[PDB]
Amino acid sequence: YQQKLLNYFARNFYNMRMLALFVAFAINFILLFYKVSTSSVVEGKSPHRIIAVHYVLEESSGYMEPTLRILAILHTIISFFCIIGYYCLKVPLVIFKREKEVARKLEFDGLYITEQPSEDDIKGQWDRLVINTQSFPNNYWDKFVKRKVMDKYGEFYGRDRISELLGMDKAALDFSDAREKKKPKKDSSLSAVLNSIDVKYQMWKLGVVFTDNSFLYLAWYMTMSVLGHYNNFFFAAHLLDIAMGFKTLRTILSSVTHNGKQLVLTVGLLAVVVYLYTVVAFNFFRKFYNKSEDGDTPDMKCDDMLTCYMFHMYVGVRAGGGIGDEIEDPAGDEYEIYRIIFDITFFFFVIVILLAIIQGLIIDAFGELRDQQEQVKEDMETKCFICGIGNDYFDTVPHGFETHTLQEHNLANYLFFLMYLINKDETEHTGQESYVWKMYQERCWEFFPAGDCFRKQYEDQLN
């Protein structure tokens, strides 16, 4: 029953994700009918706390508050189901990738035999914990890595060290008398004992899935959902899921994300330039910065450094015309010309040029993404993905390139051959299957055609 429930939760992960998005939108739409009370509540009179914070007074209705309550509870439940579905579906792929990487590193490069990586590569350092566990090739479906590393590194480095590092400590695995052949298993249904679990491997897997970024995002979703019960305005933070829930919206936001590294540097340049302008203004034009009303008032002015800098960063960038719009005019002063150049240069360098760079980076990002898609389309239309011969040679026969791409060299066929090789016992391998399987084991990739094909070697009429 638990296995069936887990499979059901794994099947409909995107369905529950979109349903959580819909219920979040519904809750936020409910949130648009709030109000704040008035009329001198029981708290005594400028009262310290007479807030009487909120109520959900409806437009001739009384269904909104229970709807909000039940929708909050339902959203929390659905999001928990989303976490369960993620762990059931997408975690095994990550664990498989990590196991594959560490297995090939050990078998081909000797990461923990002859290399011993430094303090950097924290993920690689953490990967050392899974080496000595019993169920190391849990998902890589290659259980011969531990045995095959011995035939390559055992003689040159000693059997004992590698045996202790990997964890199968035994002299020759030779049984003596029936080797405790069989007996009734202690573990059974209804949780008899259920103790044959590797805590080391479980902790390593938990660390990997707790460092995974999408799982981090789902945990944040959990935190915001459960905080929404403490305060129902916290459900507004779930509206950001539309950014990663829609492909077109991801395409729109990728324009900003493409050059987000340079946008922040542009903002930093803006800050530096504004700082220099504040330096000049503080030194010379301090008397002009009198924002006090109608003169005969306590003169509030920026006769400081941090105050003047915050003044410039607040009003002066958001003015559309620079700082000159918010200062007293230079009506007949000895610094009139200098202040004129000050204002004009500030407007022409901050308002006009820097914002132009900010608005041009996005356009360049759009152009670059479009050009990338055009390039990949043209490459696919021009040359074959496997041999790269070119359509000019194949198009001598009508539909020659299409025949070559569909029948002779096909990505789907080359993918299915790998499954056929993997799911076949070594006793039933034919000559060609064994020849390909050996080179797959030793990672040669020379059996892939390159610069040649059946038609190229044997023409239809023998040449």
Partner 1 sequence: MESHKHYTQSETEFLLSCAETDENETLDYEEFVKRFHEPAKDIGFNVAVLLTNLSEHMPNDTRLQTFLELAESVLNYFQPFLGRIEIMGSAKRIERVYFEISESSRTQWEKPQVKESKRQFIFDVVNEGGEKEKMELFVNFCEDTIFEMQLAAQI
Residues numbered 71-130 forming contacts with partner 1, rule: CB under 8 A: 89, 92-93, 96-97, 100
Q: In whole angstroms, give the CA distance from residue 8 to residue 88.
A: 10
Q: Where are the alpha helices (DSSP H) in 383-399?
A: 391-394
Cα 454 from chain centre: 43
Q: Does residue 312 interact with Zn ion by CB under 5 A?
A: no
Q: Which of 379, 390, 392, 397 binds partner 1 (CB under 8 A)?
A: 379
Our CB check for partner 1 shows the closer of 30 and 95 to be: 95
Does position 18 interact with its own copies (CB under 8 A)? The reply is no
Given 70, 192, 450, 454, the residue binding its own copies (CB under 8 A):
450
The one of partner 1, its own copies, Zn ion, none whose footprint includes residue 283, by CB under 5 to 8 A per kind, is its own copies
Burial degree of 289 (CB within 10 A; 0-12, 13-18, 19+): buried
User: Residue 367 interacts with its own copies (CB under 8 A)?
Assistant: yes
Say whether residue 273 binds Zn ion (CB under 5 A).
no
Site for partner 1 in 10-29 (CB under 8 A): 11
Residue 234 is inside which H or E element, if any?
Answer: none
Min CB(130)–Zn ion separation in Å = 39
**Helix or strand run (H / E) with residue 27:** helix 13-30
Among 163, 408, 429, 437, binds partner 1 (CB under 8 A): 408
Q: Which does 46 bind (CB under 5 to 8 A by kind): Zn ion, partner 1, its own copies, none?
A: none
Under rule CB under 8 A, residue 463 binds its own copies: no
Q: List phi, psi (to 5°) of 107.
A: -75, -25
Shortest Å, Cβ 412 to partner 1: 6
Helix count and strand count (H, E) for the chain: 20, 0
* Binding-residue pattern over the window 42 to 81 for its own copies, x denoting contact by CB under 8 A: ----------------------------------------
- In which residue are the tokens 């219920």 written? 23
Please identify which residue in 303, 328, 379, 402 interacts with its own copies, judged by CB under 8 A.
Answer: 303
Q: How close are the terminal C-alpha atoms of the chain, in Å?
A: 65
Cα atoms in the 13 Å half-sphere on the side-chain side of 77:
6
Radius of gyration of the chain measured on its C-alpha atoms: 35
- Shortest separation between residue 437's beta carbon and Zn ion, angstroms: 22
Work out how close the CB of 462 gets to Zn ion at its nearest, in angstroms, rounded to a whole number: 21
Work out whether 384 is an interface residue with Zn ion (CB under 5 A).
Answer: yes
In the complex, the smallest distance separating the C-beta of residue 400 from Zn ion, rounded to whole angstroms, is 11
Residues 199 and 409: their CA atoms lie apart, in Å, by 46
For position 417 contacting partner 1 by CB under 8 A, the verdict is yes
Q: In whole angstroms, how close is the CB of 373 to Zn ion at the nearest point?
A: 23
Rounded least distance, CB 270 to Zn ion, Å: 48
The 8-class DSSP code of residue 404 comes to I
Residues 131-160 that bind partner 1 (CB under 8 A): 139
For helices 199-211 and 213-230, angle between their N-to-C axes, nearest 10 degrees? 80
Question: Which of the listed partners (Zn ion, its own copies, partner 1, none) does 384 bind, with a CB threshold of 5 to 8 Å by partner kind?
Answer: Zn ion
Question: Residue 305 binds which entry of Zn ion, its own copies, partner 1, none, with Cβ cut-offs from 5 to 8 Å by kind?
Answer: its own copies
Which of the ranges 178-186, 223-231, 342-350, 454-462 carries the binding residues for partner 1, by CB under 8 A? 454-462
- Interface of this chain with its own copies, residues 317 to 356, rule: CB under 8 A: 317-322, 324-325, 331, 340, 343-344, 347-348, 352-353, 355-356
Q: Indicate whether 419 belongs to the interface with partner 1 (CB under 8 A).
A: yes
Q: Does 356 bind partner 1 (CB under 8 A)?
A: no
The minimum distance between CB 29 and its own copies, in angstroms, equals 10
Decide if residue 339 touches Zn ion (CB under 5 A): no
Instruction: Check residue 364 for interaction with partner 1 (CB under 8 A).
Output: no
Cα angle value 35/37/42 (rounded, 5°): 155
The DSSP secondary structure of 177-192, one letter per residue, reads: STTS-----S--TTTS
Q: What are the b/e assignments for 32-69, b being 16+ CB within 10 Å? A: eeeeeeeeeeeeeeeeeeeeeeeeeeeeeeeeeeeebe
The 8 Å CB, 24+ separation contacts for 384-389 are 384/409, 385/409, 385/411, 386/411, 386/414, 386/448, 386/449, 386/450, 387/449, 387/450, 387/451, 387/452, 387/453, 388/450, 388/451, 389/451, 389/453, 389/456
Binding segment for its own copies among 9-17, 115-123, 140-148, 446-454 (CB under 8 A)? 446-454
Cβ distance 384 to 408 under 8 Å? no
Q: Which residues bind Zn ion (CB under 5 A)?
A: 384, 386-387, 409
Q: Which residues bind partner 1 (CB under 8 A)?
A: 7, 11, 89, 92-93, 96-97, 100, 139, 372-373, 375-376, 379-381, 385, 399, 402, 407-420, 422, 431-433, 435-436, 440, 443, 445-449, 452-454, 456-458, 460
